[PDB]
């Protein structure tokens, strides 16, 4: 059944603490790469 800088565009996560969730991902703008971390209340 299921199949077993590549990461570019893939969701990443720190484990949840204090009811806050940290989502991160690396996206490319032109020749620059931005890793964004979003702290959002669960």
């Amino acid at each position: 059944a299921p199949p077993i800088h590549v990461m570019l565009n893939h969701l990443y996560a720190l484990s949840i603490k204090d009811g806050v969730m940290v989502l991160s991902a690396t996206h490319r703008y032109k020749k620059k790469y931005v890793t964004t971390l979003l702290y959002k209340p669960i």
């Binding site: 806050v20 790469y33 931005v34 890793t35 971390l37 979003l38 959002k40 209340p41």
Partner: protein, 285 residues
């Protein structure tokens, strides 16, 4: 355009130019609790963060030390960034100021100066993404790399008095005896980053900043204490009018500090030159 070289240089380059090849951007949702946001700032080692409002699906502004200062000046930590921004109707009155990657550095400096802010989010109009956060310091370093490396204008040689750069009236200062809460009030009252600490003579002995106040408060032990005692909890740079603008700049950038106290031979405070004073002098002028 030798005497306008820097202006030309800044109009020549984009905000995209001083964005790092690889960079990390910490973003808060406005529903976040102030306390948790504060701790998120510390663990990441940043002094400010862009704000994203889920209801509006938009970036609504920045969370800075000043916002904490205002808050402290009025459960502070239990409430959401939203709630606090609403108390001041911040989104409406001081709306987000952002700049495009393709906008010029000159525009960035101008925007920072005219809006009296230190953070300028670089947002891509195409995706709406925030790519980077601009500051006077980062722009100045960039300019500095250019300054040191290409022929200088004659005014770079001119002294401070000679050029009239800095602020020499209505200087906000504190006395060693001054309580911290008093200093708190004057911060909010004068919209200034740091306060020279002076003795009975008026000579400068130390510098007190908004961060000192916030550090003391996070300690949760009373604001009534004087300024020197609070300074003992920690862990000065000055200039002379006769010194050259170029020498002043190097000094600023070398110690990655934000301003100098201008002082007399006896160290009595005469003035203050900050990064913004420098940028406006070189670039905006």
């Amino acid at each position: 355009s030798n005497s306008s070289v820097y202006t030309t240089f800044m109009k020549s380059h984009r905000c995209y130019d001083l964005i790092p090849t690889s960079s990390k951007l910490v973003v808060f949702d406005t529903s976040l609790q102030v306390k948790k946001a504060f701790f998120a700032l510390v663990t990441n080692g940043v002094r400010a963060a862009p704000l994203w409002d889920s209801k509006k699906q938009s970036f609504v502004g920045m969370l800075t030390i000043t916002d904490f200062i205002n808050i402290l000046h009025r459960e502070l930590e239990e409430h959401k960034i939203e709630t606090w921004r609403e108390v001041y109707l911040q989104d409406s009155f001081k709306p987000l100021v952002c700049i495009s990657p393709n906008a010029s550095l000159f525009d960035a400096v101008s925007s920072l100066i005219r809006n009296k802010i230190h953070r300028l989010p670089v947002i891509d109009p195409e995706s709406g993404n925030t790519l980077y956060i601009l500051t006077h310091k980062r722009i100045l370093k960039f300019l500095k790399l250019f300054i040191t490396e290409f022929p200088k204008p004659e005014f770079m040689s001119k002294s401070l008095e000679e050029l009239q750069i800095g602020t020499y009236a209505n200087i906000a200062m504190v006395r060693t005896t001054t309580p911290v809460y008093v200093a708190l009030g004057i911060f909010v009252q004068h919209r200034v980053s740091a306060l020279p600490v002076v003795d009975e003579k008026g000579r400068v002995v130390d510098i007190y900043s908004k961060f000192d106040v916030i550090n003391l408060a996070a300690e949760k032990t009373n604001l009534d204490v004087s300024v020197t005692k609070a300074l003992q909890h920690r862990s000065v740079l000055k200039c002379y009018l006769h010194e050259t603008l170029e020498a002043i700049i190097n000094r600023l950038v070398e110690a990655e500090v934000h301003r100098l106290v201008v002082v007399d031979e006896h160290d009595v405070v005469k003035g203050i030159v900050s990064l913004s004073d420098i940028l406006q002098a070189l670039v905006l002028t």
